[model samples]
Target: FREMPGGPVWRKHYITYRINNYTPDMNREDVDYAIRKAFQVWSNVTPLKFSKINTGMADILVVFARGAHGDFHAFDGKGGILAHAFGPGSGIGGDAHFDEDEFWTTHSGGTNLFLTAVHAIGHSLGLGHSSDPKAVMFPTYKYVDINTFRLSADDIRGIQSLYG
Candidate 1:
């Protein structure tokens, strides 16, 4: 429920995603928690809801890769680009990739899994980078209290604009 100048979005209320792989930085349960929390960030604010599938093709595929993966965009080792995701649609759409070279953590430093996943899923749900520095959809990364993490007004407005 957002825009990026112009980007494709899903028309359905509930969507499915699958974790194609896991990062060694965290355990499967850790990764799963992060992914689910990421989805909650949006669903808590809009009509969108996300579910994970154990088998079969999913609307979104999540992966952790270093350097060049399958897509045209390649990870920049450890420091540059942390992660990225596509807008809503079929095929590669809604897919999210995390930079495997970076240390994914449960909290603070080395790129927090929850923080990155939340941002990436923002794109997956059709949100674009917000000009507001404090917004969750901002281009840069920052650590916030996961238990207290709340979408900025700018983020809420953007997502609600599309899905509200």
Candidate 2:
């Protein structure tokens, strides 16, 4: 596992996140479940706690968009970049954007939101790509059965370095 240089971490354990919108391809409940479970991946092994808010500013903002959104990094339609996230900070920091061009689903038939989101949320929590192929923070996306998924030891050590 790798940490972002300088180790920019959330100063507090009780972090807040908000889902600004929903993807049309997925059920609203599934979207919420995917995101909620994603955050749990990190919180489960560390002192960090995540809360979902309905309005106003949140530490992390999740959104789904196509092509150019508002940031310098834009989605190049589907496959290439599935999603991107910012490390902890103020303003746009810790925000995650999903490419709407890709089919986001709750299961393996389409791009699994739970898997992708766990990785994105890792970034929002100040974790970088990991060297371990079995790690959730691995750079490439690999689908594993969500029911049996667990964070690699490398992932736990990485996140605990910041929040433990």
Candidate 3:
């Protein structure tokens, strides 16, 4: 596991996130569950906690969009970049964006939304790509059994180093 530049971290343990929008590819409940489970991954290993908000601004804004949404990091198409997020900070920081062009799904049939959310949420919590391929923070995306997924030791150490 790795840290974003300067190793930024949220000052508070309890963080709030809002699903700014939903993907049309999957049911609303699946997206909600995926996002919830994604946050659970990091919170389970560290002092961090997450809450979902329906209105107003949140620390992390989860958005699903296609092409140019906002900010400098615009989506290309269906294949290039799947998603991205900002490290801990105010405003744009901690926000996450998912490319709607890709066929996001809950299972291994397509780009698994749960896995993708797990990765992005890592960044939203100030974790960068990890050197360990087994880590969810790894730069490359690989499908794994979500029901049995466990954070690599490196992931625990990395996040604990920040939050602990």
lDDT of candidate 3 at residue 77, scale 0 to 100: 65
Model 3 lDDT per residue over 37-132, tens place: 888887888877778888965777788888787668889869878888887668667888888998888888778888888778778878766788
lDDT of 1 by residue, 85-123 (tens): 887667667888999999998877668898888878778
| 60-88 per-residue lDDT for model 2 (tens digits) | 78888887988888889779888988986
Provide the overall lDDT of each model, using Cα atoms, as 2-decimal numbers: 0.80, 0.82, 0.80
- Top candidate on TM-score is 2
User: What TM-score do all the candidates reach, one by one?
Assistant: 0.92, 0.94, 0.92
Count of clashes, each model: 0, 0, 0
Indicate the residue-level lDDT of 46 in model 3: 84
Kindly provide the TM-score of model 3 when superposed on the true structure, using C-alpha atoms.
0.92
Model 3 residue 65 CA deviation (Å) reads 1.3
Model 2 Cα shift for residue 72 (angstroms): 0.5
* Higher-scoring candidate on lDDT, 2 or 3: 2
Query: Which residue pairs show collisions in model 2?
Result: none
